[PDB]
Amino acid sequence: RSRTANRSGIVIRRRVTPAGDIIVTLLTPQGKLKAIARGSSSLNLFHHVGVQVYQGPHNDLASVKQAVLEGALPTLAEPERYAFAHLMAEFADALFQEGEFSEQAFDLFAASLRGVAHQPDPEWVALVMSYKLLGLAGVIPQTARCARCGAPDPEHPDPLGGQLLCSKCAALPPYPPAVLDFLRHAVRRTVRASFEQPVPSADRPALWRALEKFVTVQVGGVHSWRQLVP
Ligand SMILES: [Zn+2]
Structure with a gap:
């Protein structure tokens, strides 16, 4: 709600055009931000970034005027971690259609990228965080x-x-009792408690299947996300 604006957030979508410019989507504490950088930070995927952004009445996309790298998770270079990070990003984009994306949702998302990058079981972090994100979206x-x-x-x-x-x-x-237990309480209890109570990986395919169905039914900007689910 101003011409110029400073925003901090994480790149969750990035496309370079043949013309040489970078079209990015960010999640920030103030919500989703769609932006363009014409042609320091290259606004790399999953980077936490600080931007100054101009938007007037003659450009529907906000224009990136300066961009500084505030933080990165180099460990998302690992194909499996990158896979689950990409799933979280696409999930966040489809859930939450913007402004509708609070400070607490941003912190949760960022935490999910940190868990995915740093922990032994990224697929477990993906699941926990997807049900926790569902909660903050009011879905x-x-x-x-x-x-x-x-x-x-x-x-x-x-x-x-x-x-x-x-x-x-x-x-x-x-359902087996541990799937049931999680399905019942995933949304309401802490990220940490759910982290310390991992559901066995033989039981996991059923959690993903319930999750897919539920989101396919309650949210409509999907298919990209569906394709990244195990
Ligand atoms: Zn019944």
Whole structure:
């Protein structure tokens, strides 16, 4: 809401044009920012960056006037970490359509990139953080009640909505207790507590499947993200 503006954030999308200029999307504490750098920092993917940005009535894209690298995670150069970082970025972009993206969502996102970069189990960090991001977006699964009939404490898969069905609405067998436990409490408890309670990787494919379904149903700017899910 001004001509010129200083913003700090993380590059979550980056495309160089044949013309030689960099079109970037950033997540900042004040929300998503779409910007262009015509042609210090090269605004590299997943870099935490400080920019001065001009936008007037004759340019719909804000124009990057100066850009300084404030922080980077060089460890996202590892294909597997990079894979999950790219998943978090695309997830954040699709969830949250902007301004709608608080200071707390920014901090959560950044923390997710830090977990992905630094921890033994990046796929576990991806999952925890995706359910925690769902919460701050106000796209919360109702796991205390059955998706169809409303019966408390549903324990079964939900093939259509990605939520939870009770035994009497469900065709499929119950989830294992640890999947169930996580599906119930992932959104509400701390990042750290969920980090110290990892779900076994044999049970994980089912968490991704519920997550896909739920997002495909509740949020519409997807397909890019779907393609990066394990
Ligand atoms: Zn039911």
